[PDB]
Amino acid sequence: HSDCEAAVNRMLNLELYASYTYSSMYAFFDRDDVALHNVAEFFKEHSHEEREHAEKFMKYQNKDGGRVVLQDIKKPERDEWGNTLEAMQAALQLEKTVNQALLDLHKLATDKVDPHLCDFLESEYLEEQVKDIKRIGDFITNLKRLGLPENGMGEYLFDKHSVKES
């Protein structure tokens, strides 16, 4: 019946949503008419990370004596992702949406005088999110430099050099 308790359930749902969107990006880049497998695997890894982030909120809820209450995991906003630049731009926005949600949870915890929840967020979530935003930003800058979307050689090269070989 707690506002933080409900907020955490919402946050867990959002992490699950983010994981599913990344999974969609993985599937797209794996397609035979897309076929950027390093880019695919980058998004697969991000999907697994976000699911791990959801499971951490489940654990926190239970340690906190709250109840985990699950809702539908909504499908991603798109069925196809265009190319590496468009997908990275959507990822950036997704990470920012998750970041603002985290920051909103932190403001709630602050108002509710819940320093344990403030620390949890600061220690387990906020800096990972700053890192992911920076790295995706950096990728977008490079994709622009490489001439996306028009420059297919540049897109091919990004897949080889910018993302780890899978």
Distance CA 143, CA 37 (A): 16
95 is in an annotated binding site: yes
Interface mask toward a second copy for 89-118; x: CB under 8 A: --------------x--xx--x--x-xx-x
Residue 114: name the closest of 3, 12, 15, 14 by CA: 3
Reported as half-sphere exposure (CB side, CA atoms, 13 A), residue 67 has a value of 4
Task: Please indicate if the annotation marks 122 as binding a ligand.
Answer: no
120 vs 32: CA distance, rounded Å: 42
Residue 8 interaction partner, one of Cl ion, a second copy, Mg ion, none, beta carbon < 5-8 Å per kind: none
Binding site for Mg ion (CB under 5 A): 64, 95, 101, 104, 116, 127-128, 132
Number of Cβ within 10 Å of residue 12's Cβ equals 22
Cβ contacts of 13 within 8 Å, gap of 6 or more: 70, 71, 73
Minimum distance, C-beta of residue 150 to Cl ion, in the bound complex (Å): 18
Residues placed in the known binding site: 15, 50, 53, 95, 129, 132
| Residues found near a second copy in the complex (CB under 8 A) | 16, 20, 23-24, 26-28, 30-35, 37, 51, 55, 58-59, 61-65, 67-76, 79, 103, 106-107, 110, 113, 115-116, 118-123, 126-127, 130-131, 134, 137-139, 141-142, 144-147, 151-157, 160-161
